[PDB]
């Protein structure tokens, strides 16, 4: 395919929507009609930063960052906070494999640089205080995927999975 955005999902209200025009087509990655959130790309070697999530590139393989994948905007046509790296659609470490993938994806991620004079100190924190659920599933799932997950009622499968979907570590600074 083409341009696509990796929306990492912590509990914070930092970059929840943050995303302008999509492709327009429905070549999405994570559609959750009735069978749980599937094809949930999550990447390793980053941290949610606990604030203004820029996904600092960490060098701990134990460390990682979870989230979803969707072909949104590059921050209203921006590149200074990205990677612009290309994919072969087999060196993507996907979760809950669902077969079908394209050949090449232009996956784009909120990027950063190493904050000097600060040991990163990535710290594991899962999803809790689930008032974030209706904050995100209405925003990043019912404004990004409001064709399924709204004409259905099997979202309790999603409800229980929200905390059971993304863990993450954080610099916690």
């Amino acid at each position: 395919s083409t341009q696509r955005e990796y929306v990492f999902i912590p509990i914070t209200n930092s970059i929840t929507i943050d995303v302008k025009i999509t492709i327009g087509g429905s070549d999405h990655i994570t559609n959750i009609d009735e069978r749980g959130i599937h094809n949930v790309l999550v990447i390793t070697g980053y941290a949610v930063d606990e604030k203004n999530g820029r996904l600092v590139p960490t060098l701990d393989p134990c460390d990682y960052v979870k989230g979803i994948l969707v072909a949104g905007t590059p921050q209203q046509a921006q590149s200074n906070d990205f990677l612009t790296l290309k994919l072969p659609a087999n060196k993507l470490y996907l979760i809950r494999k669902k077969g079908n993938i394209s050949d090449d994806l232009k996956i784009y991620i909120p990027y950063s640089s190493p904050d000097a004079r600060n040991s990163m100190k990535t710290k594991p924190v899962s999803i809790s205080d689930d008032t974030i659920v209706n904050n995100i599933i209405k925003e990043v799932f019912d404004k990004i995927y409001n064709i399924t997950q709204k004409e259905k009622v099997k979202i309790e499968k999603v409800k229980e999975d929200i905390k059971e979907l993304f863990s993450y570590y954080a610099l916690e600074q």
Binding site: V42, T44, D60, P61, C62, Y64, K66, Y93, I95, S167
Partner: protein, 475 residues
């Protein structure tokens, strides 16, 4: 005691097991277990005998009495064995599995205060600890056994081998409670060993099979005749079966390199019939030899056929199961990529593979065929009519479009075979494959169907040209 005969054979990709279920272990290596030969030779004797008994008497005899009949050859609780095997595999080394070092202590730190499950995968000569919580961290190990590249290919490309890795590759690790590293470093360390040892696979395992006689077994009733019948069951074991694991799918297939003998008065026809395989030169020419060997055990050269003895015991069809050779379901094709067909057989035995989704083109006649032929299949009778509409094909007597009726398989209730054919996790596969050749470089796939006793009756030619198209797209 004196040497009866010697059989220089080879095995094709044998999956011989051990105490750890692998061919190699921290202490030694056996690619050929002389205990499995004796155990399979006895299994291919109780089959050939019931074949000679379902072609001259219309009778079937239980296993516990056929060996009681032959216990004066193979031995039993009351008599030592008269033949003793001795396998001398080539290269005669020690060659244990030694894991020099395994530098893994980050994945340890990736596993504190959490209940994940590590999983190993061998991606491009490097293995990765696939923590299903999204951490595909690598590991830098160093061991013996030199996994070349081919087995890594052959294992990953064969859907059967890769399916049986699902045991030897992963394990959960509870760490929410008290944890350690000296304990986790030893849990993970053996998980590597029990994984890499699965890759000590080799094609062309050349070994000899010396068979000795004691010359102290006085001819009780048919000793000189029981024995030379056992040699026959040994050839058909070599010519139809293999050693090791998943031999019903081609692995461990046996060949013949050169056969010697040392007692002409007994081995005479056996070595001769065995001599006829050193220079096979045509597919349907071996299809003749497969039948040539078989009929010389049947009505031609009837080896004393003393069934009129009070040792045997007719089976009960509603409570016993017996496998014997149906001399008609046999097919000899030709192949030139052993690894390809070895991985192709999955297309022919899986309920979704692209060989029986063509031949038996439906859901039910497809599955019900495998349920009765492809050994034991995991069929979950929790869904809708697809336990009865496959039953409707396997009833003892009901509306049948295809002849897959089982001797006492009734509907609306479960008899002994009703549970056995459905819920018994250890049932051999009547549909079998075997790759055979030597000295000609002309590999011939062999396909056949063992005739069971639980079958009410089988339409021969129908299920034959099912098997016919099977052996065709398996190449």
């Amino acid at each position: 005691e004196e040497l009866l005969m010697s059989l220089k054979l080879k095995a094709l990709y044998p999956l011989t097991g051990g105490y750890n279920r692998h061919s190699i272990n921290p202490f030694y290596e056996e690619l050929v277990r002389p205990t499995e030969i004796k155990g399979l030779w006895r299994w291919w004797n109780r089959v050939l005998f019931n074949t000679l008994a379902y072609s001259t008497k219309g009778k079937l005899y239980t296993y516990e009495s056929i060996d009681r009949l032959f216990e004066d050859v193979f031995g039993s609780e009351n008599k030592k064995s008269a033949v003793r095997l001795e396998v001398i595999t080539d290269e005669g080394n020690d060659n244990r599995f030694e894991l020099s070092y395994v530098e893994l202590d980050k994945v340890i730190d990736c596993l504190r205060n959490y209940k994940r499950k590590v999983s190993l995968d061998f991606i491009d000569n490097t293995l990765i600890a696939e923590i299903e919580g999204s951490t595909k961290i690598p590991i830098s190990f160093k061991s013996n056994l030199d996994i070349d590249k081919i087995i890594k290919d052959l294992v990953h490309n064969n859907k059967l081998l890769s399916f049986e890795l699902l045991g030897f590759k992963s394990v959960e690790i509870d760490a929410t409670k008290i944890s350690d590293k000296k304990i986790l470093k030893e849990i993970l360390r053996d998980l590597i060993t029990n994984y890499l040892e699965y890759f000590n696979i080799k094609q062309e395992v050349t070994f000899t099979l010396n068979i000795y006689l004691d010359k102290s077994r006085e001819h009780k009733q048919n000793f000189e005749d029981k024995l030379k019948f056992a040699l026959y069951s040994l050839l058909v074991f070599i010519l139809l079966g293999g050693i090791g694991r998943k031999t019903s799918r081609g692995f461990g297939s046996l060949s013949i390199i050169d056969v010697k003998c040392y007692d002409n008065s007994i081995c005479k026809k056996i070595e001769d019939l065995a001599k006829n395989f050193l220079k096979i030169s045509s597919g349907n020419e071996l299809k003749s030899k497969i039948e040539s060997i078989l009929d010389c055990i049947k009505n031609s050269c009837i080896d004393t056929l003393y069934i009129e003895n009070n040792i045997l015991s007719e089976i009960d069809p509603k409570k016993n199961v017996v496998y014997f050779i149906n001399s008609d379901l046999f097919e000899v094709k030709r192949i030139n990529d052993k690894e390809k067909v070895l991985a192709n057989i999955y297309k022919a035995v899986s309920s979704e593979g692209c060989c029986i989704k063509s031949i038996i083109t439906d859901k039910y006649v497809r599955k019900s065929f495998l349920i009765a032929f492809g050994g034991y299949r995991k069929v979950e009778k929790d869904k809708g009519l697809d336990i009865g509409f496959i039953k409707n094909y396997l009833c003892e007597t009901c509306e049948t479009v295809s002849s897959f009726n089982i001797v006492d398989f009734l509907l609306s209730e479960g008899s002994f075979m009703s549970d056995y054919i459905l819920q018994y996790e250890h049932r051999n596969s009547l549909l079998r494959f075997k790759l055979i050749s030597d000295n000609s470089n002309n590999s011939y796939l062999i396909g056949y169907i063992l005739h069971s006793s639980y079958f009410k009756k089988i339409d021969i030619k129908y299920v034959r040209c099912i098997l016919e198209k099977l052996t065709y797209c398996v190449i």
